Design goal:
Radius of gyration of chain H: 25 Å
CATH class of chain E: Mainly Alpha
CATH architecture of chain E: Orthogonal Bundle
Strand content of chain E: under 5%
Shape of chain E: elongated
Structural class of chain H: mainly alpha
Largest sheet of chain H: none
Radius of gyration of chain E: 17 Å
Keywords (chain A): Electron transport, Membrane, Mitochondrion, Mitochondrion inner membrane, Respiratory chain, Transit peptide, Transmembrane, Transmembrane helix, Transport
Number of domains of chain E: 1
Subunit structure (chain A): Complex I is composed of 45 different subunits.
GO cellular component, one term (chain A): mitochondrial inner membrane
Shape of chain H: elongated
Helix content of chain E: over 70%
Helix content of chain H: 40-55%
Largest sheet of chain E: none
Oligomer: part of a larger assembly
Bound molecules: 1,2-diacyl-SN-glycero-3-phosphocholine, 1,2-Distearoyl-sn-glycerophosphoethanolamine, dodecyl-beta-D-maltoside, guanosine-5'-triphosphate, the ligand N=C(N)NC(=N)NCCc1ccc(I)c(Cl)c1, magnesium ion
Number of strands of chain H: 0
Number of helices of chain E: 3
Largest interface: C-D, 40 and 38 residues
Subcellular location (chain A): Mitochondrion inner membrane
CATH topology of chain E: Helix Hairpins
Family (chain A): Belongs to the complex I NDUFC1 subunit family.
Distance between the termini of chain H: 59 Å
Order of helices and strands of chain E: HHH
Strand content of chain H: under 5%
Chain lengths: 48, 19, 459, 98, 98, 347, 320, 113
């Protein structure tokens, strides 16, 4: 039950939680932006 | 009965220096 | 085929997210609904197979096998849930997962349009089957049985892999539709003798061929009931299905390459029927019965005539329902007396009347009583083998005599006579057990009314 | 030897639940399991599935072939043609070797 | 080739056979390794000097640098073998048969 | 070892391997091997016991001998071509010496005797480096010199490695020796396909490293180095027994798991060159690998071996080991087959 | 930052926290020799942490909520049953001794972890270094087989080599007849069955092996019954010890870091206490172990890693 | 083509993989499986624990997988481009055959009796 020793993971590591969600959002935004570049570049080179 | 599981005799087949 | 693959996959989340007391209810209910929708596969045409995409197709050969496969999963669940009752909850869910994953590989195996995709799925069934046998079998010998099952299959499968890749290199394609139009004859050479063997030995081991059958009495006996049901009903038919497809590209070399294997089968069935007369283990007796029946399928596939292909297809379906029912019948006794010895419990018709009716019906279908589809298939194969050579009627006739003797010997020894005095825990048959028996026999007997849907592409 | 549990005794489902259907120890789950097996197995798959099979639309076009054959026999006998010729393909479209 | 190469290639082979045919002392075999490096240095130096491959003149120097690192590494392990067993005999290093 | 010293030595192990892989000059390739050899010995001795001393001594003698043969090949090549560019060699005797030297560094049969002994004598963490990272440098060199490699020699080494690796593993109960003989066998597949399609050599190498890392990491998590100590895992971390089972099945090459992909592609490339007998022989011989992988699955996951009373004290503590990348590695070790056409990224 | 190589590099080094008052003191003696009281007073006067002797349920006191678990989760080994039937057929005598050694091994690691991480010394009551006296007594009375003794020695060799002996070993020398009287006055029925030959074996081992061994590597204070009563006089003895011997003088930040990485990883500490050696006394069949392991996971707060058990009020699990 | 380059510039004349590519979805599913295995080995609630960690497993798998598929598609385009250009440059090695119908081609009949 109530632990005789405070667990190492008893409470969230908010510095980590923020970095993890921030990285996910950054990578997703980078990926989406990159994909739009490629689609636009691909049509331009191919006259579309 | 119940399902057989390895006993000590079986387990020592795999405890030697070589097989 | 995605309308069957996806819901079959969705059985896995269903089982894992079920309440701890509803895993059997939920999985059984929904595997039956999948079984229902499999009947849409019977939109078959006289000329063209049903070709869904670049990956999957269905024809009158694969369609009945698919319907049998999806029907067996519900039946394997009911058969299993009694002896797994004490099992840990998560281990129960894993057991169901293996059965679901086995179904997924089977329905894709029977419909893969490309032979190398068939090979990968043909081989992928080993993993769940091996885990089921070795993890959830009861005896010490289950470990050895798994090894025999694994290496007998792989010893034949690995040459098949090389042969298929060689065929793709030289023909340019392994798609089965393409192979129907781009096929070229196989001319005699030692090189082609071994191409033929590599294309056929993997499937012969699965049947099994007499001589290469030793893995099956071990595996079909050590497995848990569900493992035996799928091994006998479906997995043996991967060998027959594979042969039926690949023999297209082996002509005319099959003319003389079939002789050693027809001899092994014609004589093999008489040898394995005779073995059943002196078997002391009820499950072992049933297993050796499967070898005898699948010998006819091997001969029918090799002689390669329109009647023998219809007979082979009927036999594979009929044997699947019969052999599965017999294992389930013997399991019900085993769950009462905890022994596979046939002579241990006798006179059971006195103590379990209705269950003795199932024993009779299962026995009659096994000895091919007309007009059961067991007889229809066995008769069509005999008709075509007589034309191949009239003297084969002697071996077919003798096997039919011996098969009746051991089918009724098993019925008489276990059900008739006097009950064993000291066995006093023969509880009345449960509803689950009676329903499980009737779900084999009823569909099997109904198909007699409309046998054309289990006669394959050459009907 | 070792420290091991003895083999547990055999459990007869009928002692606790005389009305057991053999599915589950819990009588309520046991009844539900029987219901789904019977309704989905017998009422749905076997009864409706058998009805579906019986009314399949001309499975593998065996009925069209009989209708087509009658049409051909009628036309060929009326016009004096042979009912069936030994040659499947017209020999004017074939170039024999040699 | 010129006759010098016969004797240098012979020297490398003699040291190689010396390395592959152990006796007892581990130090005897470490000496054969240094001999192998000596013959490579001479054979490399002759080829480079004869052909006037000017920049390659430093290559034999670099070879000696890593010959010393190899020699120092070999002696360090010999010290630890000596401490464990009291001799540098190679027959004492047989624990890993099992 | 001081933590900073350990990191610097590990970076020197990687730098030596990287020097081999970016060098256009044979002297720098030889330097890279020497630097790599220098930094790995302290990692083998890190636990300071007579078995680690013997392991490191046997490793140094074998690697230092191979380096002499390698440098001899380079000098012969210089005499007959007057250049040092890393590429095909210009003398068949130089090609034999370099090929034998690289086979020695890889521990291919019949130069294999050191691999089972050295791996057994060093920690699990050091054995992981020895059987994965250390294969990269010799393989990268073979990848560049293969046009001048003698076909009969390289296929003889490959065949003997598959046989000896398979047979040798049958008699082992120690996990490190099981991994060592497995590595010898897998090296045979890598170099068998090298003369035909070097791209398939890299795929086999990459997939082998992933599966080998996955196994060593799982052994480290439980601090298990014998078959019997690994048979207690079911009574501590049941999830780990399932991951071990899946990886072992994968390493055996069973479909639909990833480890079947390299064997599949290697057979394809060999049959395209009308090599039928060899791939059939290799695949059948590889069943020996599957046999002693299966034995491990039997004693680890598919049965429940006897345990000890003191094990109950372990139930009350969680796994504390890093187990770095293990979730990713095990997924890649088992679930990659549907993505096989991705092998073109290696072209 | 959980301790590791990164914490070491950034400055977390043992020699920073360790002073002249960072000592490991062990209090030993026979049964009912007054160890407990003397150990508690020494800890309080010297300002150290006190560790009550490690018993059967020591490990429970450090994990979970710190309360004893049912006895099936300690193997059912019973100290009371050892007194009633020292020659039990179910191997309770050795199973208990093997369980107790592992509990002491764990307590020693906890004591070392506390000492190295905070610099505050600790006081123990017996330890892994003196646990063998009970085993030797058990063997001389015929309570265990020679094979049990062999197994104990195999486990000790590969475990005790990793740690450092205590700085100070305090021994309370109470002669056996006095102990028998003390046990008799205490009152608990089971302990009254101890025979004098058993207590003499504990004493013979303590003086014939433990003390000569500890002397070469530790400071040893040997007190009689009367001297031991006044804990103040013992504390005075400890305060003027020279500390001129033993393996602690050779320790450096590099070595204590390696030691800290071991004692903080309890599964690594206990690694070899379950070596696959199949003695009947300690071997558990697969069916029994499986059942008990399932029941252990069904206890409050034991299904998951500490801090992820919602049944006992853990929150933010979806972010933890 | 370009030396030690992951995605040569000539690869931008090809369409990028769609973000709904079935192979990319499978790769994302692998990231999800990795997240679950991560929870399981650390005895955390498998489905629920650490959703941020599970999100990063999915996102990082998809991110790397997108570039691998982009390079995979490019390398097969290069294979096709090389093969067809070679066929154009050596017509005599790849002659266009005269195709005969089955009415003209003699094939032996092998009875199945
Ligand atoms: C009374 C005299 C004694 C005769 C004995 C009694 C039997 C006759 C009574 C029935 C008469 C009615 C009749 O026959 O018509 C039926 C008719 C056959 O006669 P029919 O072909 O003329 O059909 C009549 C309807 N029309 C006119 C439109 C064609 O149909 C059937 O036979 C139904 C077929 C049932 C088979 C399907 C099985 C269920 C499949 C479930 C899937 C899982 C099973 C396992 C999978 C196995 C692999 C496939
Ligand atoms: C996707 C396309 C590619 C296709 C390739 C195949 C894909 C699958 C790849 C598998 C990769 C490994 C990941 C498998 C996850 C296993 C999940 C699992 O084992 O369940 C967890 C459970 C752990 O138990 P625990 O944590 O203690 O929880 C309480 C229950 N005791 O586990 C247990 O409790 C089990 C303990 C008993 C041991 C039972 C062993 C038999 C069951 C094995 C099933 C898994 C086999 C996987 C091999 C591949 C199958 C095809
Ligand atoms: C025993 C295992 C260990 C030893 C390895 C086995 C190899 C020895 C078996 C020899 C089999 C015959 C053979 O290898 O044929 C080679 C042949 C090469 O012909 P090729 O040049 O490619 O084509 C043009 C022809 N001029 O190949 C071909 O032409 C194509 C042939 C298709 C590929 C066949 C694969 C070999 C099959 C051999 C095993 C078949 C028997 C299976 C036994 C199962 C046992 C249960
Ligand atoms: C793609 C494959 C990637 C493989 C990832 C390997 C992850 C291995 C991590 C295992 C678990 C964590 C661990 O500690 O590894 C052991 C080792 C550190 O040593 P350790 O004993 O833990 O403590 C050192 C203190 N003296 O950790 C190490 O030193 C790392 C050793 C592995 C390096 C080689 C990995 C294979 C090749 C990677 C390149 C891919 C091609
Ligand atoms: C639409 C999805 C369809 C599913 C496709 C599956 C493809 C194979 C993917 C393999 C990876 C599986 C995930 C890794 C295992 C994690 C699950 C586990 O280890 O334990 C089960 C766990 C419940 O137990 P617990 O630890 O107590 O956590 C409580 C959380 N509620 O967690 C759970 O509650 C359930 C989590 C899922 C259980 C997975 C069981 C493993 C299945 C392995 C069999 C091989 C896969 C089938 C082969 C064909 C592949 C298509
Ligand atoms: C080939 C086709 C298939 C494609 C295969 C692609 C494989 C390569 C793709 C990458 C695979 C690894 C992905 C790992 C995802 C899990 C990372 C995570 O959840 O970490 C959570 C947290 C640390 O997160 P944090 O490092 O602070 O984020 C800020 C970064 N600057 O701390 C934690 O609690 C995490 C603990 C679990 C991690 C296991 C140990 C590895 C350590 C990873 C460190 C962070 C990784 C960041 C990943 C970014 C990669 C783009
Ligand atoms: C269960 C195992 C079953 C084993 C079945 C055994 C079947 C044996 C089939 C033998 C026929 C093989 O096919 C035969 O191969 C040889 C190859 O040498 C071919 O003949 C070719 O080589 C032989 C040399 O021996 C020459 O005589 C001939 O001039 C040449 O064309 C034949 O034209 C062909 O008829
Ligand atoms: C395990 C049981 C073993 C039982 C023993 C079985 C023996 C089986 C021997 C395999 C068949 C060998 O005999 C095989 O006969 C057929 C004819 O029918 C031959 O077939 C070939 O030769 C005939 C003429 O001889 C030609 O029309 C043609 O070139 C081709 O058909 C094969 O070249 C020959 O290899
Ligand atoms: C087109 C797809 C159709 C899919 C159809 C699938 C049908 C599956 C039938 C299973 C029905 C089970 O539904 C059942 O309902 C009751 C209340 O509603 C639930 O709740 C009940 O559980 C317990 C059983 O121990 C009962 O004693 C109690 O009355 C109640 O709490 C059950 O937990 C649930 O199992
Ligand atoms: C582990 C063994 C250690 C041995 C160390 C000693 C190595 C000695 C290396 C000597 C290298 C001699 O190299 C050898 O030279 C002769 C030239 O006469 C070549 O000889 C060959 O090529 C030339 C022309 O190209 C012609 O003479 C002829 O075609 C043929 O004899 C060999 O192809 C080559 O292999
Ligand atoms: N078999 C066995 N019993 C032990 C061991 N340690 C303690 N005991 C028993 O645990 C009980 C308490 O031991 P003691 O501390 O010495 O007795 P006490 O009453 O507390 O007197 P104090 O020394 O002051 O603490 C005794 O019955 C001991 O026999 C051990 O390592 N093995
Ligand atoms: N077989 C070899 N050794 N070389 C080789 N890979 N030949 C095949 C050519 C090829 C294949 C894939 C790609 I993508 C590309 Cl661009 C080129
Ligand atoms: Mg006390």
């Amino acid at each position: 039950k109530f632990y005789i020793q405070e667990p190492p993971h008893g409470s969230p590591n908010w510095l980590k939680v923020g970095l993890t969600l921030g990285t996910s959002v950054f990578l997703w935004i980078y990926l989406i932006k990159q994909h739009n570049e490629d689609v636009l570049e691909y049509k331009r080179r191919n006259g579309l | 009965a119940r399902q057989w599981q390895p006993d000590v005799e079986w387990a020592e087949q795999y405890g030697g220096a070589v097989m | 085929m995605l309308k069957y693959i996806i819901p079959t996959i969705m059985l896995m989340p269903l089982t894992w997210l079920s309440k701890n007391n509803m895993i059997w209810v939920n999985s059984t209910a929904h595997s039956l609904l999948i079984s229902f929708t499999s009947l849409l596969l019977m939109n078959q045409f006289g000329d063209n197979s049903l070709n869904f995409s670049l990956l999957f197709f269905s024809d009158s050969l694969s369609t009945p096998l698919l319907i049998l496969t999806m029907w067996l999963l519900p039946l394997m669940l009911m058969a299993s849930q009694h002896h797994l009752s004490k099992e840990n909850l998560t281990r129960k869910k894993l057991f169901i997962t293996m059965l679901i994953s086995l179904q997924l590989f089977l329905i894709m195996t029977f419909t893969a349009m490309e032979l190398i995709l068939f090979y990968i799925l043909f081989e992928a069934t080993l993993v769940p089957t091996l885990i089921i046998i070795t993890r959830w079998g009861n005896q010490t010998e289950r470990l050895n049985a798994g090894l025999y099952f694994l290496f007998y299959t792989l010893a034949g499968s690995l040459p098949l892999l090389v042969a298929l890749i060689y065929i793709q290199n030289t023909v340019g394609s392994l798609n089965f539709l393409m192979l129907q139009y781009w096929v070229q004859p196989v001319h005699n050479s030692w090189s082609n003798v071994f191409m033929w063997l590599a294309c056929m030995m993997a499937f012969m081991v699965k049947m099994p061929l007499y001589g290469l059958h030793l893995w099956l009495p071990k595996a079909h006996v050590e497995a848990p009931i569900a493992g035996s049901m799928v091994l006998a009903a479906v997995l043996l038919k991967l060998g027959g299905y594979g042969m039926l497809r690949i023999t297209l590209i082996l002509n005319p070399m099959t003319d003389f390459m079939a002789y050693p294997f027809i001899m092994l089968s014609l004589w093999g069935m008489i040898m394995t029927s005779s073995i059943c007369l002196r078997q002391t283990d009820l499950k072992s007796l049933i297993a050796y019965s499967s070898v005898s029946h699948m010998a006819l399928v091997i001969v029918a596939i090799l002689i390669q005539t329109p009647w023998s292909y219809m007979g082979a297809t009927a036999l594979m379906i009929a044997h699947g329902l019969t052999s599965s029912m017999l294992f389930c019948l013997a399991n019900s006794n085993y769950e009462r007396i905890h022994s596979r010895t046939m002579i241990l419990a006798r006179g059971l018709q006195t103590l379990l009347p209705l269950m003795a009716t199932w024993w009779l019906l299962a026995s009659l279908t096994n000895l091919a009583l007309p007009p059961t589809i067991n007889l229809i298939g066995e008769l069509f194969v005999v008709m075509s083998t007589f034309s191949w050579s009239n003297i084969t009627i002697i071996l077919m006739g003798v096997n039919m005599v011996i098969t009746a003797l051991y089918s009724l010997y098993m019925l008489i020894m276990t059900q008739r006579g006097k009950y064993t005095y000291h066995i006093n825990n023969i509880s009345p048959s449960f509803t689950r057990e009676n329903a499980l028996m009737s779900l084999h026999i009823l569909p099997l007997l109904l198909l007699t009314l409309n046998p054309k849907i289990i006669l394959g592409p050459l009907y | 030897r070792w420290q091991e549990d003895p083999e547990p005794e055999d459990e007869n489902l009928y002692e606790k639940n005389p009305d057991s259907h053999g599915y589950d120890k819990d009588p309520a789950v046991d009844i539900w399991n029987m219901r789904v097996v019977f309704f989905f197995g017998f009422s749905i798959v076997l009864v409706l599935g058998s009805t579906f099979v019986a009314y399949l639309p001309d499975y593998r076009m065996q009925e069209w072939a009989r209708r087509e054959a009658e049409r051909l026999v009628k036309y060929r006998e009326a016009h004096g043609l042979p009912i069936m010729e030994s040659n499947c393909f017209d020999p004017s479209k074939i170039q024999l070797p040699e | 080739m010129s006759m010098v190469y016969m004797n240098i290639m012979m020297a490398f082979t003699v040291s190689l056979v010396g390395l592959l045919m152990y006796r007892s002392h581990l130090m005897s075999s470490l000496l054969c390794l240094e001999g192998m490096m000596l013959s490579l240095f001479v054979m490399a130096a002759l080829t480079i000097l004869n052909s006037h491959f000017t920049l390659a003149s430093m290559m034999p120097i670099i070879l000696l640098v890593f010959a010393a690192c190899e020699a120092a590494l070999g002696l360090s392990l010999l010290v630890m073998v000596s401490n464990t067993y009291g001799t540098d005999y190679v027959q004492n290093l047989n624990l890993l048969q099992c | 070892m001081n933590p900073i010293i350990f990191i610097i030595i590990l970076l020197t192990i990687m730098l030596g391997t990287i020097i081999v892989m970016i060098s256009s000059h044979w002297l720098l390739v030889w330097i890279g091997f020497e630097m790599n050899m220098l930094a790995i010995i302290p990692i083998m001795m890190k636990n300071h016991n007579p078995r680690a001393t013997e392991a490191s001594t046997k490793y140094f003698l074998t690697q230092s001998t191979a380096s002499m043969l390698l440098m001899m090949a380079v000098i012969i090549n210089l005499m007959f071509s007057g250049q040092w560019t890393v590429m095909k060699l210009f003398n068949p005797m130089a090609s034999m010496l370099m090929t034998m030297a690289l086979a020695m560094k890889l521990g291919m049969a019949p130069f294999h005797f050191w691999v089972p002994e050295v791996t057994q004598g060093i920690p699990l963490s050091s054995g992981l480096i020895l059987l994965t990272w250390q294969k990269l440098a010799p393989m990268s060199v073979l990848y560049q010199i293969f046009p001048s490699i003698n076909l009969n020699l390289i296929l003889t080494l490959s065949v003997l490695s598959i046989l000896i690796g398979g047979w040798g593993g049958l008699n082992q109960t120690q996990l490190r020796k099981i991994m060592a003989y497995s590595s010898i066998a897998h090296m045979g597949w890598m170099t068998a396909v090298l003369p035909y399609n070097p791209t398939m050599t890299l795929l086999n190498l990459i997939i082998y490293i992933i599966m080998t890392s996955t196994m060593f990491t799982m052994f480290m998590a439980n601090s298990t180095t014998t078959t019997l100590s690994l048979s207690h895992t079911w009574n501590k971390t049941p999830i780990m027994t399932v991951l071990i089972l899946a990886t072992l099945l994968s390493m055996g090459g069973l479909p639909p798991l990833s480890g079947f992909m390299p064997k599949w592609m290697i057979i394809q490339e060999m049959t395209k060159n009308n090599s039928i007998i060899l791939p059939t022989f290799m695949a059948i011989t590889a069943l020996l690998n599957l046999y002693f992988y299966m034995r491990l699955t039997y004693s680890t996951t598919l049965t429940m071996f006897p345990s000890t009373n003191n094990m109950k004290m372990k139930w009350q503590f969680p796994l504390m080991k890093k187990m770095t990348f293990l979730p990713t590695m095990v997924v890649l070790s088992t679930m990659m087959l549907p993505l096989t056409p991705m092998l073109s990224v290696l072209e | 930052l959980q301790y590791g190589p990164l914490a070491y590099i950034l400055g977390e080094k043992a020699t920073k926290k360790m002073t002249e008052k960072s000592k490991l003191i062990t209090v030993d003696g026979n049964i009912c020799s007054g160890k407990s009281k003397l150990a508690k007073e020494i800890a309080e006067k010297l300002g150290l942490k006190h560790f009550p002797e490690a018993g059967i349920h020591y490990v429970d006191s450090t994990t979970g909520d710190g309360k004893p678990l049912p006895v099936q989760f300690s193997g059912n080994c019973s100290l009371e049953k050892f007194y009633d039937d020292p020659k039990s057929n179910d191997g309770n005598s050795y199973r208990l001794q093997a369980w107790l050694y592992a509990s002491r091994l764990l307590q020693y690691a906890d004591a070392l972890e506390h000492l190295l991480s905070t610099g505050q010394g600790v006081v123990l009551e017996r330890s892994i270094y003196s646990d063998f006296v009970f085993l030797e007594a058990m063997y001389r009375q015929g309570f265990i087989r020679k094979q049990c003794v062999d197994h104990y020695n195999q486990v000790k060799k590969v475990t005790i080599c990793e740690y450092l002996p205590p700085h100070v070993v305090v021994y309370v020398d109470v002669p056996v007849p006095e102990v028998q009287s003390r046990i008799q006055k205490k009152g608990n029925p089971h302990e009254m069955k101890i025979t004098s030959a058993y207590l003499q074996d504990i004493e013979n081992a303590y003086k014939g092996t433990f003390l000569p061994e500890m002397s070469e590597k530790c400071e040893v204070l040997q007190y009689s019954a009367w001297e031991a009563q006044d804990a103040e006089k013992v504390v005075e003895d400890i305060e003027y010890l020279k500390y001129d011997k033993g393996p602690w003088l050779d320790q450096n930040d590099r070595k204590l870091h390696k030691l800290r990485m071991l004692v903080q990883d309890k599964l690594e500490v206990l690694n070899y206490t379950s070596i696959p050696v199949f003695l009947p006394e300690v071997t558990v069949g697969a069916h029994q172990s499986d059942q008990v392991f399932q029941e252990f996971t069904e206890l409050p707060g034991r299904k998951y890693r500490a801090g992820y058990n919602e049944d006992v009020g853990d929150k933010w699990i979806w972010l933890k | 083509r370009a030396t030690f380059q992951f995605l040569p510039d000539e690869a931008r004349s090809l369409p990028p993989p769609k973000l709904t590519d079935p192979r990319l979805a499978f790769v994302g599913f692998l990231g999800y499986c990795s997240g679950l295995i991560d929870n399981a080995i650390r005895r955390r609630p498998v489905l629920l624990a650490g959703l941020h960690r599970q999100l990063l497993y999915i996102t990082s798998f998809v991110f790397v997988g997108y570039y691998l598929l982009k390079r995979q598609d490019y390398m097969y385009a290069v294979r096709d481009h090389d093969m067809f250009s070679y066929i154009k440059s050596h017509p005599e090695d790849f002659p266009e055959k005269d195709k005969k119908t089955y009415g003209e081609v003699f094939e032996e009949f092998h009875p199945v009796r």
